[PDB]
């Protein structure tokens, strides 16, 4: 612990060309474990993690049928939102749904989440209480009123608090040999000269999970300003990478230290350029 399971369902309309594209991607923490793709020759939910491959034909048949029902559900939703916004039948639009549940170190139910987007923007979201809804616009108010009558929050709450948590614990057991690992960052400071200044670049490689913090310090104080930083990128082997650079005066490299924060580290790392 702590661990979470997240599903990402997306449907994109393609008027004229054919039917909308429907994709599902499932994650246990930062590891993808399932995928569904309507554009595949024989569309079915498939494993994306070799520890998921153990799951039998009854599991895959059940998840394929669930995926195919959602695909049709979002095909109707796309046509419904077209009437809410009074949009034309010739345009491409997207619906995104992301939902999940977080478990603790125990692991018992911590947090649950469920929300939608239309054309890249918030549409409707389930509140932290898993009981009430937050509509983002006047169209989302129509959906909220309909779902309040149908008791949609109660149906989803049961899943998020119970069904979601028991399946995440099963996948955590199936994939324990790798899912329960914390690969600590492999760090090094590179030096690059320039107006008589030097670029110091603190690297963090081979870490898992993705959540990391890289900071530069000068005499106990963090250099928030004039600090370049890249987005955490996947190495493609299950680990992540990140770097943070600073521009310091030539020959003063020993005064700057890079501080690394990762759950895989008992204490934060401290490193500098090594001549």
């Amino acid at each position: 612990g702590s661990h979470s399971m997240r599903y990402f369902e997306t449907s994109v309309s393609r008027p004229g060309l054919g039917e909308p594209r429907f994709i599902i991607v499932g994650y246990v923490d930062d590891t993808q474990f399932v995928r569904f793709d309507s554009d595949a020759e024989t569309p079915r939910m498939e494993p994306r993690a070799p520890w998921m491959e153990q799951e039998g034909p009854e599991y895959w048949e059940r998840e394929t049928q669930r995926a195919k029902g959602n695909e049709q559900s979002f095909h109707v939703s796309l046509r419904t939102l077209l009437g809410y916004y009074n949009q034309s039948e010739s345009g491409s639009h997207t619906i995104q749904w992301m939902y999940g549940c977080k478990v603790g170190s125990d692991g018992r139910f911590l947090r649950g989440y469920l929300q939608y987007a239309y054309d890249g923007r918030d549409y409707i979201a389930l509140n932290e209480d898993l009981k009430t809804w937050t509509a983002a616009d006047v169209a989302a108010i129509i959906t909220r009123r309909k779902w309040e009558q149908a008791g949609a929050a109660e149906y989803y709450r049961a899943y998020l608090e119970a069904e979601c948590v028991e399946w995440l614990l099963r996948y955590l057991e199936l994939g324990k040999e790798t899912l329960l690992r914390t690969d600590p960052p492999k760090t090094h400071v590179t030096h690059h000269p320039g107006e008589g200044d030097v670029t110091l670049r603190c690297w963090a490689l081979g870490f898992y999970p993705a959540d990391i913090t890289l900071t530069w310090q000068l005499n106990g104080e963090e250099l928030t300003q004039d600090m370049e930083l890249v987005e955490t990128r996947p190495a493609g082997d299950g680990t992540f990478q990140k770097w943070a650079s600073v521009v310091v005066p030539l020959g003063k490299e020993q005064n700057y230290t890079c501080h690394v924060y990762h759950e895989g580290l008992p204490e934060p790392l401290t490193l500098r350029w090594e001549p």
């Binding site: 669930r66 995926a67 559900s73 409707i124 779902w147 069904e163």
Partner: peptide, 8 residues
């Protein structure tokens, strides 16, 4: 496993 979507 995931959940069944309720129509918007």
């Amino acid at each position: 496993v995931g959940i069944t979507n309720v129509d918007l």
